[PDB]
Design a protein around this ligand. Structure first.
Ligand SMILES: Nc1[nH]c(=O)[nH]c(=O)c1N
Ligand SMILES: Nc1[nH]c(=O)[nH]c(=O)c1N
Lengths: 112, 112, 112, 112
C-alpha cells in the first residue's frame, strides 16, 4: 500500500509548473507511464501505489525543455529532459519526490 | 576549445566529496569515461574539452550511493546513482556543472 | 483572507524536521510569533492569515542550529539560526515557503 | 589567516549575477562593508580575511531585488534582500559561501 508522488515548482515564475510531461520507468526498462501535470503541478493519481510500487530503482523523465519552451528556454536548451534516478526500498512507504526547477538548475529531494 | 567541468559538495559534512565515481556518456550511448574525484571534489582534467566536446546531450552518473556508504547511507539507499542529463549547445563554451549533494536531495546547476 | 505557511525537510534523514523553533517578525520589528513545528514538520495554524497578513517584508528565524544539535551539528555550528527575508505583496494570496535544510546548506523557495 | 568568499549564480540566465550589492555585517551590528560583484559574480578581494575574520556569527545581504529589477522581477518583489546568517567558528579556515539565486528561491551552501 505504498505510494510515489511528485510535484514541480517553476522557480522562475514562482508558480507550479503545469502540463509538463513526466516519464516514469523501472531501472533498465523503458517508459511504462507518461503523465502530464495539472495546474497545481501534480498528477491526480500517484505515479505508483499499491501492488505497482515495488522495491527497486526507478527513473523519472521531467520534460523541462518543452515546458520552458512553451514560455520563452532556447533552440537547444541546456536542460532538455531532466532525469532522476532513485531507489524505493520499502514497498509500503510513501515517497514524495518534488522537483524544484529553473532553466539552469534544479533541486531534487524527498519531501513528504 | 570548449570545456566541461564538474564539482561535488557534501552538504552534510560541508566538505568536498572525494573519490566519488563519475560516469560520463553521450545520450543513447554507454559509459565513455569513468573518473574518480580528488580531495577538492573535482577531477584534474576536465571530463570534456577541445575536439572531444561536441554539441548534443550528455549524462553524468555520480555515484552518490557508494560515497555515502563509505561514510555511514543504508543497505538500499534512496539515492544510488544520481543521474544528470543536459545539453551542451556551443562546442566552444565552458560548462561548469556542480552537484550539491545530500543523502536525500541534490542541487544540479550551471555555475562557472 | 491570505495565508502564509511554511514547511521544513531534513535532507539528511529524509524526514520532516520537527520541533524546530520558528521565529516570525515584520521587517524592522522583533519577534511577534514563535512556533515549534509538529511531526510533519509544519505548524497546525498558519504563521499568518486573514487580517494579520499584510503586504510588506517579513523574516523567519528557523532554528536549525538547535535542531541538528538534538540529533548530533557541532559546538559552534555553521548554521545557527537560518534567517529568511521575503516580501508578501498581495494581502489575499497564499504563500507556502518551505525550507529544505542540510547542516551546510538550505533551499528557500515558494512552493504552493 | 582565514578567509570568507562568496559567489552568485543567476539560475535563470545560467550566468554569474554581476553588480549585485552585498552587505556584510556582524551579528547584532549594522553594515560594515558593502560590495558590488564583478562580472564573474564575485568580489576581487574577500569580504573577510586575516585579522578581520573572527569567530562569531555574520550576515550577508544579497540585493537580489534590485538585481532582477535591472533585468525585468516586479514592483514589489517576493525576494527583495536575500539575507544569510551563518557562524564562522575557526578564525583561520576558509569559507566559500555561494548563493544560487532564482526569482523565487535560492540555495545557500558552503562550497570550497
Ligand atoms: N510543503 C509541501 N507541500 C506539498 O504539498 N508539496 C511539496 O512539495 C512541499 N514541499
Ligand atoms: N564559487 C565556486 N567556485 C568553484 O570553484 N566551484 C563551484 O562550484 C562554485 N560554486
Amino acid at each position: 500500500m505504498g505510494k510515489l508522488t511528485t510535484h514541480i515548482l517553476d522557480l522562475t515564475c514562482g508558480k507550479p509548473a503545469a502540463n509538463v510531461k513526466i516519464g516514469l520507468k523501472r531501472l533498465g526498462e523503458s517508459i511504462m507511464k507518461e503523465v502530464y501535470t495539472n495546474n497545481d503541478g501534480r498528477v491526480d493519481v500517484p505515479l505508483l501505489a499499491g501492488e505497482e510500487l515495488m522495491s527497486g530503482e526507478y527513473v523519472m523523465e521531467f520534460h523541462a525543455g518543452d515546458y520552458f519552451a512553451s514560455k520563452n528556454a532556447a533552440d537547444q536548451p541546456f536542460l532538455t529532459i531532466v532525469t532522476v534516478r532513485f531507489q524505493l526500498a520499502d514497498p509500503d512507504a510513501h515517497y514524495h519526490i518534488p522537483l524544484l526547477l529553473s532553466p539552469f538548475g534544479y533541486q531534487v529531494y524527498r519531501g513528504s
